[PDB]
Design a protein around this nucleic acid. Structure first.
Lengths: 216, 95, 102, 251, 31, 51, 19
RNA sequence: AAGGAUUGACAUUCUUGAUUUUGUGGGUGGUGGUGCAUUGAUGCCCUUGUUCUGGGCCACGCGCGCUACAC
């Protein structure tokens, strides 16, 4: 029961890795921006020192491979970059584990722009256009992950919504700052636990809420 | 850890073709990335912030490392690699 | 050997450029000190002692006599006016809300 | 004969890089034989640095006659050799800032560069480059008006249309002479050059950028022949905006 | 302070003089 | 729980000593080790050729 | 207090030497 | 504002002449890449690039004794 965006009836959990930072650069050769591997390039570009981190979404592979809802099939991952770019992933991509192979998977952002498999029947990674709401299911809950929002158990939060046909969570995969709350889709923010969680542990807490709500 | 002649590294699946095969072992078992991304998850979990957790690790070579809750493990990978080299050879890391 | 190749070639062409620039500055200095006022010998032996232009000057003087002007600075639509009006309204309303809240 | 250190001056100014200038070649204004001495230096060879500082001193001693003496014989055509021999057509910042230092004295700058650039060899790419370097920096206003006058009375070339288009998105405050010049530009393009030529989108955008705000000395018969101008030359991008400037302009 | 530094440098010049008066070497032995 | 940052040197080498930020105490420690090994080797060699 | 901001970079020896 | 603006400075003292000069305002700045026929308001990323100063090498190990460091 694989899940694309084009069967908007069924019950899904949509994660939106929002305000990501994976950005390409031209050195003959093609690199992408890490804070660790180059800082003089950030200073010459005049960027902020801190927010050139695709390590956060590469660590948020764990919601793609959060097995007891992804091996149930009921999860789907979209990514929206600070460069305004929406990347779909398929719920059966076996993502590259190491960051050097994830660095090598910049052909989706630069060259190939949609990857096939070795037998090449189902597309894995896509560079689709905005908004997210059109690709979401018909009824869809309106949730971003803030900190100073009211805290609630995501078990009870998913359980009290009887059949809202999905649950979408906009998680800001940035270093510092503030996510687009009133800009696009979310009128109410649900806060997770009492501490300033990182993006990866926020996604994992919501994924495990979905597991123990929908009985893995 | 391993020597290059001048340099010390932590054994990856990716920093070498056959340093692991020269040492005898196979390359699939030299994965420090997964204990890195476990250590990140455990030390960003809320139970660690609440102070109800501590993280011990034990290497396949039989080396036990105690990991304080108060530590800030670095977020990228090769920063953690350079941390693990000095931990494995100086047996201690201060703040 | 690759880094020594880059360093050696750059130092070689850098020393070549420095030698050429020093030679050109020395040539400028010596030619100055032998031809600045040393050309006072040749300063006396060998010496040397428009209708469309008037039309252009006539048009310039006629515009200087009488001219006129251009309305205002731009040309754009009332749809862009409504867009910029809603933009200024939204910016000033959120700015007043931020000033109230803090 | 001349004092003939000019072999040394030409040898160093072939590949001059940085530094100070020979002061005989600094006070070459106040000696009476400047053209006759550069005729025996013969600098077909050039450094772009001495192009820049030499045209600085040449502005410091150019009139109509001096501009004819140096700039209208070898230096304008050296700029032409630079643009044709630049294979990616990259006219350098050296040459451009030489032009921007050159643009200062407006006394006969028309015959300095704008008269001999419509001689031959001006394509539309060199034309948009020359209009760009004209629209970059400071200009004489009355000579811009006079320039629009004579370049519009000049024969029809798409280099001159993009020249005049840049000179009209200068966003001037237009004299009567140039407004009458533009209404006889419409009287110049009639069934003129409507059966002998056709005018696509570049000519279209030229007169649309004219009609953007160049309408504040226009009475109703001028509105009427602009109305049948767009009625003859109906494109897709005329209707609301040129009807808007027709309802927007005044006498 | 730097007196230790300079007496130590003259001490090792004394020692290298001493070695070169006889037939000694630097570090040259084989494992 | 408070969160401290770990102090460690980058491009660590155990065989080289630590980079002390003083060039007049790291230098005296270097040259103390140098005189100790050269003095030991020197007087070892002169007593064994005396033997 | 490091709320996911990451521990900062430390300048290299040659970068501190170029001064 | 030549009864003096700015240009060239023979270190202070004369060879250029409205390009003025100063405010008040204000247009962003195109030597760009990418399908189309090889000149065509074309979907999609950038504007505010010239001349000198660039380097660590392929404090040795082991070990007995002694000394530090513990309400």
């Amino acid at each position: 029961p694989v899940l694309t965006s084009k069967d908007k009836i069924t019950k899904r959990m949509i994660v939106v890795l929002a305000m990501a930072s994976l950005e390409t650069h031209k050195i003959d050769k093609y690199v992408l921006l890490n804070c660790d591997d180059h800082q003089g390039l950030l200073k010459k570009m005049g960027r902020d020192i801190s927010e050139a981190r695709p390590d956060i979404t590469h660590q948020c592979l764990l919601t793609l491979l959060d097995s007891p809802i992804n091996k149930a099939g009921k999860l789907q991952v979209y990514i929206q970059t600070s460069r305004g770019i929406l990347i779909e992933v398929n719920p059966t991509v076996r993502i590259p584990r190491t960051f050097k192979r994830f660095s090598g998977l910049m052909v989706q952002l630069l060259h190939k722009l949609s990857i096939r498999s070795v037998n090449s029947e189902e597309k894995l990674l896509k560079v689709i256009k905005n908004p997210i709401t059109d690709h979401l299911p018909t009824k869809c809950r309106k949730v971003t992950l803030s900190f100073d929002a009211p805290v609630i158990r995501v078990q009870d939060y998913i359980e009290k919504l009887d059949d809202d046909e999905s649950i979408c969570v906009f998680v800001g995969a940035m270093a510092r700052g503030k996510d687009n709350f009133a800009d696009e889709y979310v009128d109410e923010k649900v806060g997770l636990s009492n501490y300033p969680l990182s993006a990866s542990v926020a996604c994992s807490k919501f994924c495990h809420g979905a597991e123990d709500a929908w009985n893995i | 850890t391993h020597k290059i002649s001048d340099k010390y590294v932590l054994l990856n699946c990716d920093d070498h073709q056959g340093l692991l095969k020269k040492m005898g072992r196979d390359i699939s078992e030299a994965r420090p990335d997964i204990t890195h991304q476990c250590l990140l998850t455990l030390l960003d979990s809320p139970i660690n912030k609440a102070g109800k957790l501590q993280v011990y690790i034990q290497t396949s070579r039989g080396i036990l490392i105690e990991v304080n809750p108060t530590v800030r493990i670095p977020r990228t990978f090769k920063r953690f690699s350079g941390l693990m080299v000095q931990l494995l050879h100086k047996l201690s890391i201060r703040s | 050997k690759k880094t020594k190749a880059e360093v050696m070639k750059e130092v070689i062409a850098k020393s070549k450029f420095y030698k050429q620039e020093r030679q050109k500055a020395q040539g400028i200095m010596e030619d100055q000190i032998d031809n600045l006022d040393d050309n006072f010998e040749d300063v006396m032996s060998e010496l040397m002692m428009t209708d469309l232009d008037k039309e252009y000057d006539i048009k310039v003087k006629e515009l200087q006599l009488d001219k006129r002007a251009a309305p205002s600075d731009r040309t754009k639509t009332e749809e862009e006016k409504n867009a910029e009006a809603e933009e200024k309204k939204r910016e000033l309303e959120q700015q007043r809300l931020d000033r109230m809240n803090g | 004969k001349v004092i003939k250190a000019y072999t040394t001056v030409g040898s160093i100014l072939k590949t001059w890089t940085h530094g100070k200038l020979p002061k005989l070649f600094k006070v070459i204004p106040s000696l009476r034989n400047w053209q006759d001495v550069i005729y025996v230096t013969n600098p077909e060879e050039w450094s772009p640095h001495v192009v820049y500082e030499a045209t600085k001193l040449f502005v410091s001693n150019l009139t109509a006659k001096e501009s004819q003496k140096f700039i209208n014989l070898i230096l304008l055509e050296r700029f032409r050799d630079n643009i044709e021999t630049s294979e990616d057509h990259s006219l350098n910042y050296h040459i451009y800032r030489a032009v921007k230092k050159s643009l200062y004295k407006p006394s006969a700058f028309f015959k300095g560069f704008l008269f001999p650039l419509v001689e031959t060899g001006c394509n539309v790419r060199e034309a948009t480059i020359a209009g760009s370097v004209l629209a970059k920096v400071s200009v004489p206003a009355l000579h811009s008006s006079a320039a629009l006058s004579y370049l519009l009375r000049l024969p029809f070339s798409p280099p001159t249309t993009v020249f005049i288009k840049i000179l009209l998105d200068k966003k001037y405050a237009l004299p009567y002479q140039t407004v009458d010049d533009c209404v006889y530009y419409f009287m110049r393009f009639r069934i003129g050059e409507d059966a002998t030529r056709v005018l696509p989108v570049i000519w279209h955008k030229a007169f649309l950028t004219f009609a953007q705000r160049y309408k504040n000395d226009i009475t109703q018969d001028q509105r009427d022949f602009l109305l049948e101008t767009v009625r003859q030359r109906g494109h897709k991008d005329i209707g609301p905006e040129i009807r808007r400037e027709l309802l927007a302009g005044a006498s | 302070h730097t007196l230790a530094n300079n007496v130590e440098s003259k001490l090792r010049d004394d020692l290298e003089r001493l070695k070169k008066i006889r037939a000694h070497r630097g570090i040259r032995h084989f494992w | 729980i408070p969160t401290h940052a770990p102090k460690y040197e980058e491009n660590f080498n155990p065989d080289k000593k630590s980079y002390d930020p003083d060039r007049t105490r790291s230098e005296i420690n270097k040259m103390k080790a140098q005189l100790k090994k050269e003095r030991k080797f020197t007087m070892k060699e002169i007593r064994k050729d005396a033997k | 207090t490091d709320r996911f901001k990451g521990d900062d970079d430390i300048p290299y020896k040659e970068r501190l030497f170029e001064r």
